[PDB]
Design a protein around this ligand. Structure first.
Ligand code: STL
Ligand code: STL
Ligand code: NA
Ligand code: NA
Lengths: 115, 115, 115, 115
């Protein structure tokens, strides 16, 4: 799995299920080009975003719609979204897991990068 | 001072000093308009970005140049920047403190919103 | 798996491998009684700490030896250990995943609790 | 003020006010001796715990009563407390700021250590 995103809910102590996100890749004109998207599963995970051949060097942005997630729970959150912007594959293919831990006024994110 | 940003370094146990950041505000055409910028002080704080009169309702993005910070310490970090996107002042004027805690492959961010 | 611990390294962007930890359970005299222990695998995970029948209501403490982990990497960390203290199984059995994200001067921890 | 603790609430986007905490110091017999205690102010800060003369080399534990804080808001949280265990002043006197960011099922903590 070249790119996987895992989302956790720090308020309820659960996977964050049905969280929508889009992935973009920076174009030569510095605009954000659509690249991938999906919703987290019942495990809070989004697999199958891309393939090794398609996922080449670039700057990528994962934009996670945390606002809709909290609004569905009756909570007015701080952020419009959680976004994770990173260069990928600059030294050739790697596997990336992006994790995001969500609270109404805070988020934490980390990456696990494996060869 | 209706908007303050504080940045901390989780590797060295220190304020993150001389960290650059840019603040944008979403324009009516959905583009990001430059709003303010600056660098953190020896306390890791950036004060004086805006004024009560200038800091109107809107969607704001704070883009913290974490990459240059880590590269100056000899570390190749994961993220291009740490970004915080939020709606401000939609129920009237508030004071915002945005805090960010930085590691090479991770960041955590929270907001303190006061009336 | 009634109790699993997952440990991540925010400096290197990797699972935290070979991280030792002990689990204790609070006794009636408020002392900490040994309960379980182990080291994280190459995935940063420690499975098989306990069984459903043995893991009953109590206050549990997971004490993760983060100091030895950082010292092995030539880093002088802040904490002696990362500890996670929680009541478990007070409403009958649950499955617990405890995650810890480690930096030299900081740690973040969350729990996923499932029925 | 060689030791200060600041506590933030990630659910409400506010300082965590009136949060109790106890500080212990490890005695020669490996027991935890009471060292200081207090409650956070309206800014989420607890100042004046100790003095330069009293704050000697040692292993210290800060135990933050996060459980009572969440219970007072109607939330049944995961942790009994958030705790921070660290060696202080072993290379000479330092000033320590311990920060903790709280959610019902998660906490993040960092230290700022200055000379
Ligand atoms: O601040 C943070 C604290 C904890 C975590 C947990 C991340 C994580 C990543 C995985 O691949 C599996 C998992 O069970 C958890 C992320 C951020
Ligand atoms: O994960 C975390 C993210 C952010 C913070 C903030 C800490 C902090 C410490 C201060 O002295 C002042 C402040 O405004 C914030 C702590 C942990
Ligand atoms: Na390269
Ligand atoms: Na019960």
């Amino acid at each position: 799995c070249p790119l996987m995103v895992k989302v956790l809910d720090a308020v309820r102590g659960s996977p964050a299920i049905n969280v929508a996100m889009h992935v973009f890749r920076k174009a030569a004109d510095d605009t954000w080009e659509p690249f991938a998207s999906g919703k987290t599963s019942e495990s809070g995970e989004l697999h199958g975003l891309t393939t090794e051949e398609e996922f080449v060097e670039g700057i990528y942005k994962v934009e996670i719609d945390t606002k809709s997630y909290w609004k569905a729970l009756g909570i007015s959150p701080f952020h419009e979204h959680a976004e994770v912007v990173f260069t990928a594959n600059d030294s050739g293919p790697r596997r990336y897991t992006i994790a995001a831990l969500l609270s109404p006024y805070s988020y934490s994110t980390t990456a696990v990068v494996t060869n």
